[PDB]
Symmetry: C3
Subunit: 73 residues, 3 copies
């Protein structure tokens, strides 16, 4: 397998995650606007839930970036 | 135009976005401390709003990072 | 010192921050689930607090990534 493979797999996953993240962002915006219109505790809690969802994937992405940077140098 | 240009433009935008993000972070901290002092539903909603704002820009930054990594390899 | 040192220090800090971020994520998940079980304004405020905590470190990480990319080119 080796290095080029690693790279290619990593960048592949990178773009996949970004599209997930642009998707999740779409939902946040939707939620946020419902929020702004109709504030509510329970609505705050579904919103924070999506936020954490987003954070998880960002961290994943950063983990992948670090690996690419480590491999290339 | 080509490759070096692309790179230079990308890194330029990268740093611009970071300063935006350090700026937005300043506002979050301010908001957060008002929050911690004076909890409130509506204050929670302005806070979550800034959070999403921050997330949008992070995703943008990551999109730019991916592109740089893709170009250099 | 110079370039290789810079790189090595940067990647070192990168991984340190990621482990911090995976740690903070663990706490968010814990908090989030308490939230989902027991919604509350004050619980929302401790949650948003961890969120901002996470954001700070992400921004830091991105600052480090940018620097690596700038150095390597």
């Amino acid at each position: 397998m080796g290095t080029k493979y690693e790279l290619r797999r990593a960048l592949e996953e990178l773009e996949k995650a970004l599209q997930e993240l642009r998707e999740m962002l779409r939902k946040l915006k939707e939620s946020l606007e419902e929020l702004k219109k109709n504030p509510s505790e329970d609505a705050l809690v579904r919103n924070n839930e999506l936020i954490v969802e987003v954070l998880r994937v960002i961290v994943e992405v950063l983990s992948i970036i670090a690996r690419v940077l480590e491999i290339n140098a």
